[PDB]
Amino acid sequence: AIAKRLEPVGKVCVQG
Amino acid sequence: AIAKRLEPVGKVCVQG
Amino acid sequence: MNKFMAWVDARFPATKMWEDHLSKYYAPKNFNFWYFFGSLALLVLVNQILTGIWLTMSFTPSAEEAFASVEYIMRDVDYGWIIRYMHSTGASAFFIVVYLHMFRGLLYGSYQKPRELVWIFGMLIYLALMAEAFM
Amino acid sequence: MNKFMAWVDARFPATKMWEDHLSKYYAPKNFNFWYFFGSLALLVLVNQILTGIWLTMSFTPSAEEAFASVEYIMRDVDYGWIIRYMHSTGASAFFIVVYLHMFRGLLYGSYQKPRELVWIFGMLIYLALMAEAFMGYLLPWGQMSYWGAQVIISLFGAIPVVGEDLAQWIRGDFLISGITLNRFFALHVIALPIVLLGLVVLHILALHEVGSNNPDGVDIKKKKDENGVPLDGIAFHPYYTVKDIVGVVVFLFIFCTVIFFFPEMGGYFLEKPNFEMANQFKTPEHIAPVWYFTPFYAILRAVPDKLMGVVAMGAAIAVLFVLPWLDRSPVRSIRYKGWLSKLWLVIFAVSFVILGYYGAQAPSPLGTTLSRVCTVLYFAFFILMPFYTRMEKTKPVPERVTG
Amino acid sequence: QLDHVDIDLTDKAAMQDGARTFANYCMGCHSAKFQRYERVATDLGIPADLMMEKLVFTGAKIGDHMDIGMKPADAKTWFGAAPPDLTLVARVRGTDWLYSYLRSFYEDPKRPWGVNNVIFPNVGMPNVLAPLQGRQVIGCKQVQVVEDGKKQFDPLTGTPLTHEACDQLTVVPKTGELNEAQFDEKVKNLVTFLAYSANPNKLASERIGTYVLLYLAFFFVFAYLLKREYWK
Amino acid sequence: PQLDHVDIDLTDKAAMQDGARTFANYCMGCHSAKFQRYERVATDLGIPADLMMEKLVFTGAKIGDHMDIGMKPADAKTWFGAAPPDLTLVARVRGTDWLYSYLRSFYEDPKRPWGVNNVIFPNVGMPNVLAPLQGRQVIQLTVVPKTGELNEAQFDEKVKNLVTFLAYSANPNKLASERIGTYVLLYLAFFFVFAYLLKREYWK
Amino acid sequence: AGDAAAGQAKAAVCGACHGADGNSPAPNFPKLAGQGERYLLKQMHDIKDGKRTVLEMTGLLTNLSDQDLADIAAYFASQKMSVGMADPNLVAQGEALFRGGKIAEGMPACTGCHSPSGVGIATAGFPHLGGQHATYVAKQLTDFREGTRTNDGDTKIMQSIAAKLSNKDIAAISSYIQGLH
Amino acid sequence: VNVGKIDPGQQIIAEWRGKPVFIVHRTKEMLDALPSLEGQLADPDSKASEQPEYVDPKLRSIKPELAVIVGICTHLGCSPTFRPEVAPADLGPDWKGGYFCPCHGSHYDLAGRVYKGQPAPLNLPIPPYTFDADDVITIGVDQE
Numbered sequence A, B: 001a002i003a004k005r006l007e008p009v010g011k012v013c014v015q016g
Numbered sequence C: 001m002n003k004f005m006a007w008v009d010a011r012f013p014a015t016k017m018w019e020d021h022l023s024k025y026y027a028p029k030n031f032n033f034w035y036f037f038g039s040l041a042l043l044v045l046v047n048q049i050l051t052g053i054w055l056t057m058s059f060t061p062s063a064e065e066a067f068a069s070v071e072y073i074m075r076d077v078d079y080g081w082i083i084r085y086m087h088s089t090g091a092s093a094f095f096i097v098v099y100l101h102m103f104r105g106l107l108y109g110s111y112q113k114p115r116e117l118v119w120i121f122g123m124l125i126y127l128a129l130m131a132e133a134f135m
Numbered sequence D: 001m002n003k004f005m006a007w008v009d010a011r012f013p014a015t016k017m018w019e020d021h022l023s024k025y026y027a028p029k030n031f032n033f034w035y036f037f038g039s040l041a042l043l044v045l046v047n048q049i050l051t052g053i054w055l056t057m058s059f060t061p062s063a064e065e066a067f068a069s070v071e072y073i074m075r076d077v078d079y080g081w082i083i084r085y086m087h088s089t090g091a092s093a094f095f096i097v098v099y100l101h102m103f104r105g106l107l108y109g110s111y112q113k114p115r116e117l118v119w120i121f122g123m124l125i126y127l128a129l130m131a132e133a134f135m136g137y138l139l140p141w142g143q144m145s146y147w148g149a150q151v152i153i154s155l156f157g158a159i160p161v162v163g164e165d166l167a168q169w170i171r172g173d174f175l176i177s178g179i180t181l182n183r184f185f186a187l188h189v190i191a192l193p194i195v196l197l198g199l200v201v202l203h204i205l206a207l208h209e210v211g212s213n214n215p216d217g218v219d220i221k222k223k224k225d226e227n228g229v230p231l232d233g234i235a236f237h238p239y240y241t242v243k244d245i246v247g248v249v250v251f252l253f254i255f256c257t258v259i260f261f262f263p264e265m266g267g268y269f270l271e272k273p274n275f276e277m278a279n280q281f282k283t284p285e286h287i288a289p290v291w292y293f294t295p296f297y298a299i300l301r302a303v304p305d306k307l308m309g310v311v312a313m314g315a316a317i318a319v320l321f322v323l324p325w326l327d328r329s330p331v332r333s334i335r336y337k338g339w340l341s342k343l344w345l346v347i348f349a350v351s352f353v354i355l356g357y358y359g360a361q362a363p364s365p366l367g368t369t370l371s372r373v374c375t376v377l378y379f380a381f382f383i384l385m386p387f388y389t390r391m392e393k394t395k396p397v398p399e400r401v402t403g
Numbered sequence E: 001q002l003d004h005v006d007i008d009l010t011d012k013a014a015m016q017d018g019a020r021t022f023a024n025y026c027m028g029c030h031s032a033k034f035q036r037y038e039r040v041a042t043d044l045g046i047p048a049d050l051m052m053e054k055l056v057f058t059g060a061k062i063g064d065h066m067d068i069g070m071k072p073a074d075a076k077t078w079f080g081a082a083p084p085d086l087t088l089v090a091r092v093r094g095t096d097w098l099y100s101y102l103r104s105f106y107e108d109p110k111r112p113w114g115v116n117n118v119i120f121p122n123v124g125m126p127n128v129l130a131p132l133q134g135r136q137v138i139g140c141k142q143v144q145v146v147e148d149g150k151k152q153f154d155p156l157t158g159t160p161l162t163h164e165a166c167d168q169l170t171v172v173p174k175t176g177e178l179n180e181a182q183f184d185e186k187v188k189n190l191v192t193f194l195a196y197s198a199n200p201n202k203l204a205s206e207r208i209g210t211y212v213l214l215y216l217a218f219f220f221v222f223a224y225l226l227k228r229e230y231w232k
Numbered sequence F: 001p002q003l004d005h006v007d008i009d010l011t012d013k014a015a016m017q018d019g020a021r022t023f024a025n026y027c028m029g030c031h032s033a034k035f036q037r038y039e040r041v042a043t044d045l046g047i048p049a050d051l052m053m054e055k056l057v058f059t060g061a062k063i064g065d066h067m068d069i070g071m072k073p074a075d076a077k078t079w080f081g082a083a084p085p086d087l088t089l090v091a092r093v094r095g096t097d098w099l100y101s102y103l104r105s106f107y108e109d110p111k112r113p114w115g116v117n118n119v120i121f122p123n124v125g126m127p128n129v130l131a132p133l134q135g136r137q138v139i140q141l142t143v144v145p146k147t148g149e150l151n152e153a154q155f156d157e158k159v160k161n162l163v164t165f166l167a168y169s170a171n172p173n174k175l176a177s178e179r180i181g182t183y184v185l186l187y188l189a190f191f192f193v194f195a196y197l198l199k200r201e202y203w204k
Numbered sequence G: 001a002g003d004a005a006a007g008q009a010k011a012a013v014c015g016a017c018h019g020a021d022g023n024s025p026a027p028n029f030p031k032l033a034g035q036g037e038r039y040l041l042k043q044m045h046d047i048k049d050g051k052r053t054v055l056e057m058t059g060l061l062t063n064l065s066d067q068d069l070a071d072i073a074a075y076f077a078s079q080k081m082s083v084g085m086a087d088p089n090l091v092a093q094g095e096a097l098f099r100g101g102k103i104a105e106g107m108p109a110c111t112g113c114h115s116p117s118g119v120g121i122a123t124a125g126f127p128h129l130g131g132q133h134a135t136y137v138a139k140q141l142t143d144f145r146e147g148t149r150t151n152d153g154d155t156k157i158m159q160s161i162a163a164k165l166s167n168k169d170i171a172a173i174s175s176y177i178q179g180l181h
Numbered sequence H: 001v002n003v004g005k006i007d008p009g010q011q012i013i014a015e016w017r018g019k020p021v022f023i024v025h026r027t028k029e030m031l032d033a034l035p036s037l038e039g040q041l042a043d044p045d046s047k048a049s050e051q052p053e054y055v056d057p058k059l060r061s062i063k064p065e066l067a068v069i070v071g072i073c074t075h076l077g078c079s080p081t082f083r084p085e086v087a088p089a090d091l092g093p094d095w096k097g098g099y100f101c102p103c104h105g106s107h108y109d110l111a112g113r114v115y116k117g118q119p120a121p122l123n124l125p126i127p128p129y130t131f132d133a134d135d136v137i138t139i140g141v142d143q144e
């Protein structure tokens, strides 16, 4: 709940 | 007199 | 204790001072609302001294750290926010109480003879308070 | 002006206080060198207050800037070095003058009835002074400052149960840090100065209530003239005011000599290692207290046990409080006490000096042996006082002061 | 055992040479951050432009403190011990200690920097004045003979009578720019500058104190007369 | 200018957590909150220390460190023409209503250095950093349709949560203050009755 | 300690790249003349053991024993490094960086560990720098900055120091060092 | 501090409370030699030293594999040098790994126990730490 509420905005795609 | 007394130790040889 | 007070009184003006200033010191019996403010000014002065002493334990009088040290008092020092609020509200209450005290003096002519020196010392106190609060 | 003073006297007991405390206040006429030190203590207290207020205008009570702020005072502030040396030399001179003051009290039995409360207020003043000087010595934030504070506050860790919690609470941190620095600065700059001023007021008030002792121990109040003035009494103002002015000038000569020519005083007024910034991770090869704390340090170092050493150091100061009840001599002045009292006063002075001298150095075999012997003698001067003050034969005190 | 050095704080030339030595050979690792270039120039008699051109290498202003780029933590990591600020080192250690320490470096392969110090054994400081002094070693050299303080000089030449001792600081010949006397003078000037830096108010302190003591003697005369009189 | 009222609830841990997330992601790039610590924010917002370190501490700082940022005030003042002030106490400097109206009043103004102006703060040096969420807002303020992730209601909640966190940041002692003040006032009312009765007894 | 007299004979193979006396003519080859014997020996041991990677020296030191390396290092340390010339357009910045470092960035001046004249500290192992080729000095500073060269020890003295030097700073300071004496 | 990545016979340096804490992964031969070093230590049982009540008096660590020692020499607070080598030429032949203080030549074993007759009067401090997991420890909170 709190973890989802605090998820960072920036999402990064990573190989594999 | 002071200027000679205060000369920096490191001497650099420069082109021209 | 009776024996202890007898011992003290032969060596200190304890009972004589108590009976000259607080007990056996006969003030007019018709003091009203406006005569609370000398004792309240004393209390606010004591509060200012104590809270300021505790603030000085965490304040940094440097342009780089004064604001930061105040926030450190507000946030990091346990109950430091309480002490700082006591201090600031106590400055404001000091001036409230002192203004009401001076206005009592105006209302009842407490500056008139023989209390001219009382009034002048009060005005010196007020000047010192203005300087203290500004600084 | 006559009219102005008449106006004031109707509204303020100015003339009454002046005639009750300084003029028409008849002190014994046989004060000697040993009675200069109350006025000199007042002068040094005023000097400390003024110079400290001015140092505070430039000092920064943070671990990051305290030492740098002291150097800023020493170099950047106009005449700031003068004010700083006045303050350090004034702390050292405060302890010199106060120790000579206390030794006068010992010499002339000035703690005895009726001056027991005077002595107790004086001892409270001494406790406040020790706390003030200890907390001030931390302010420079040098190596000596930091590590002496560390050891002195670790002493509070010797209390068997609450010792560690009490030490942490005093420090305000898990070690000596800028929190401790700022806290001790606040205590040293306001709280203890206020306590000291109040204690000095109470001390002088008690003295004026019971009157001064004199070198002969003669109660001058017993013999009075037809006007009620003691025969051996003279008005404090102007005679002793001018005498104290001369004493103040002599003290100022010595004080300024130290300030302007020997401010460090061979590293005793300003310790050499304290000119290095505090290092939490390197301690000095030998850490010692300021000289005026050295005697008690020696006592603490003389006791092999830690808690027992702390207790003994505390008792070394606490016994002086009960001194007025330890002395059972029928006479006050050492001039008329028996040979035992003179011998034990000599022993106490020598033991105090030796304890201070050996507490200022790193431990040594002869040093440790003499420190233990002098601790025993220092405590015996008080513990045996109720006995050797009775066993001795005292001379008859003259009815009139000698001179 | 320290060596005594007679340090003249009124010698502007010596302090200037010491300041040059400090700025060149010393401020690489050591700061003098409690001391400003402006005050150093004013007290040493160095013109401000000359101080800027000759002694300020860090791009600081004349009024700036003698700070350096080497941080204490970095230098502690690199050398094993942080090079202390040297503004007050003359007060911390004394001038004799500094004079003996800067001349007591000798080669010691067992040590991290290949050198040790008689005054400061196992010091973490590299011998940065080796180019000037030359290679100094714990070897055998001629030392004046002394028997219970019976020091022998040559009556005629006035030079010492010497015997060989095999545990002495000897400078390897033709290894440094300066001979023993020249390096002695260099170290003396450097320690004189450090002594000034530790106590920059010394000369003014003596002057002001002389005037204060004269005034206090005058005032004592008057107070003593006012006391002895009025006590009749 | 006319401000929009917002009811800030400092007991809403979820709202303050969302506001802290928004502050850490969109605001700490230029603004510091250097007068509060990550540890205290986590404690007051109910955020576990590990979760706070993972989700809100991006500078590599410790949990007990102040919420400092890399952008130095001098550099930011040079770059933007004005220094982004520390936002720890901004809710006390400006108030929650002013912040709520300001963060929703950015509109496009090509004459400005950053292409935006603010109704609450005319000629402000702030770039419109929440444009991705609100969308393109133009002048009365209207949001161009299909230009932001959030609608008007969703963006207002985002600003409200952010302002709520800012409100908490300015005054982290408010909840503890109201709790302590209630007992202090109860004791003083209790003490007043005894003092009043004692005075009444003596003044007979 | 090594023997310079025998090192001269043992150093003939090296003189192909570093010059007969250790004063290399080509900028990319460092001058070994006048370099600290301790530093020279440390570098040669590092290259033997792979702690420092010099591809141009692959297998040149494997057959040389410890005493041979000591002799070669003594021979090169017994010479005098020739002094080059600094670029006038770069000498000011390079001199400022060398003598003062960077107070703001906390970069030390090079005059502490390497002498104000750039002779280094032979006993401490701090290399002689003055007169060293600007190209080689710049390459070494870049390698320290990027971690390519890590044989400065666990303390990472020069890696940390070079981390604070920009490319322009590296070029300017190398040019200044080339003419430093 | 994550300690499962320390290869046999190597140590890492953590920073706790301003102080450097050496975390050493002590191999077998070291712990076999330590019981043979009691004849040269002034405080082999750490009677007068400072350490938690839950560490072994001899090994002075929660578990023999890991050694958590505040790397501050008792004598003047210098950081000892880690010397895991068996018989260094300059540590003498009796060396069996440990800590060598460079400032004044104080010696400690791999358990932080000071050698006899050295400037260091006490053993190296053992900070209050615990094992949250087999590969991670916390320096600052006592073991339950």
Ligand SMILES: COC1=C(OC)C(=O)C(C/C=C(\C)CC/C=C(\C)CC/C=C(\C)CC/C=C(\C)CC/C=C(\C)CC/C=C(\C)CC/C=C(/C)CC/C=C(\C)CC/C=C(\C)CCC=C(C)C)=C(C)C1=O
Pocket: C043, C050, D130, D131, D134, D135, D147, D148, D149, D151, D152, D153, D155, D170, D287, D288, D289, D290, D293, D296, D297, D300, D313
């Ligand atoms: C090497 O090493 C060593 C040396 O070194 C180098 C040494 O030198 C020495 C030798 C050591 C020495 C001899 C040196 C000695 C030095 C010392 C003695 C230093 C000791 C100093 C300290 C460590 C400081 C310790 C301080 C302590 C423990 C005291 C703490 C005090 C406080 C925190 C104060 C508490 C605060 C309070 C109570 C707040 C006030 C509360 C109020 C109620 C205020 C009023 C409030 C109101 C009025 C509101 C309520 C209203 C009421 C009451 C209702 C009615 C209203 C009315 C007003 C009537 C040794 C051994 C050593 O080895």
Ligand code: HEC
Pocket: E021, E022, E025, E026, E027, E028, E029, E030, E075, E079, E081, E082, E083, E084, E086, E089, E092, E093, E098, E101, E102, E122, E123, E124, E125, E126, E128, E129, E190, G111, G112, G113
């Ligand atoms: C002019 C050439 C210099 C003088 C004069 C001094 N230094 Fe240094 N130094 C350096 C380090 C790493 C240390 C610490 C060593 C240790 O703590 O074991 C020192 C120490 C000193 C001291 C001792 C001061 C004390 O209170 O003990 C003095 C008096 C001193 N230094 C004077 C390093 C360096 C360094 C880096 C290469 C340079 C260039 C210098 N020191 C230069 C001088």
Ligand code: HEC
Pocket: F022, F023, F026, F027, F028, F029, F030, F031, F076, F080, F082, F083, F084, F085, F087, F090, F093, F094, F099, F102, F103, F123, F124, F125, F126, F127, F129, F130, F162
């Ligand atoms: C850099 C791109 C910024 C980011 C991202 C955010 N802010 Fe900002 N802020 C920035 C500047 C340059 C200024 C000064 C503008 C001026 O003209 O002075 C500001 C100012 C504010 C203010 C005003 C505070 C005051 O005037 O007292 C507020 C309330 C503010 N900023 C809030 C804020 C929020 C909530 C942000 C994340 C949504 C945010 N800022 C990001 C630069 C930048």
Ligand code: HEC
Pocket: G011, G013, G014, G015, G016, G017, G018, G028, G029, G030, G031, G032, G035, G040, G041, G043, G044, G053, G054, G056, G057, G060, G061, G064, G072, G127, G136, G139, G140
């Ligand atoms: C060309 C084939 C070379 C010969 C023959 C030798 N060396 Fe050399 N060396 C060479 C290069 C290109 C470099 C620089 C590497 C770099 O990182 O840029 C070096 C370096 C050294 C060094 C280091 C010098 C310093 O750090 O100041 C040393 C000490 C060294 N080389 C020694 C050395 C010896 C002993 C040789 C003969 C046995 C020798 N080199 C030959 C290229 C070449």
Ligand code: HEC
Pocket: E078, G030, G042, G097, G098, G108, G109, G110, G111, G112, G113, G114, G125, G126, G127, G128, G129, G132, G137, G138, G140, G141, G151, G152, G153, G157, G158, G161, G173
């Ligand atoms: C403190 C010690 C410093 C200081 C402040 C600087 N350096 Fe130098 N440096 C140092 C060491 C211990 C070494 C040896 C590295 C090793 O053993 O591998 C070096 C080496 C260099 C080199 C390489 C020289 C060569 O390969 O011949 C260069 C080019 C160098 N250092 C340059 C340099 C510069 C430009 C500095 C100021 C910015 C500087 N150093 C400072 C130790 C130290």
Ligand code: HEM
Pocket: C045, C048, C049, C051, C052, C053, C054, C055, C056, C059, C070, C084, C087, C088, C090, C091, C092, C094, C129, C132, C133, C135, D190
């Ligand atoms: C008549 C007595 C006093 C008055 C009227 C007074 C008034 C004030 C005022 C108005 C402030 C500003 C507070 C703020 O705006 O946050 C302040 C600050 C401060 N005062 Fe005083 N003061 C008095 C005595 C003292 C004393 C005796 C001390 C120390 C012993 C002290 C210590 C401080 C400190 C450290 C600050 C800065 C911290 C803070 O702002 O809370 N004060 N004072």
Ligand code: HEM
Pocket: D045, D048, D049, D050, D051, D052, D053, D055, D056, D059, D070, D084, D087, D088, D090, D091, D092, D094, D129, D132, D133, D136, D137, D138, D139, D140, D188, D189, D190, D193, D196, D270
């Ligand atoms: C009995 C009275 C006092 C005594 C015995 C005393 C003693 C001391 C001592 C010994 C020091 C250390 C000085 C040093 O070694 O550098 C010091 C420092 C200091 N004191 Fe006090 N002090 C007294 C009163 C005061 C007062 C009233 C103030 C301020 C109102 C004050 C302010 C300071 C400051 C700011 C410092 C730090 C600067 C410095 O160290 O010189 N002091 N004090």
Ligand code: HEM
Pocket: D034, D035, D036, D037, D038, D039, D041, D042, D045, D098, D101, D102, D105, D108, D110, D111, D115, D118, D119, D121, D122, D123, D125, D126, D129, D200, D203, D204, D207, D211, D212, D213, D214
């Ligand atoms: C530290 C600041 C102190 C100040 C400013 C001070 C002030 C004075 C003064 C002005 C006098 C009268 C003149 C004189 O007898 O010298 C006096 C007397 C006295 N003082 Fe102090 N005093 C201080 C500390 C102490 C201490 C620490 C003690 C003892 C522990 C003490 C014990 C006494 C006694 C017993 C007397 C009266 C004895 C007699 O009349 O011979 N005082 N004090």
Ligand code: FES
Pocket: H073, H074, H075, H076, H077, H078, H079, H101, H102, H103, H104, H105, H106, H119, H120
């Ligand atoms: S610093 Fe460790 S033995 Fe002295």
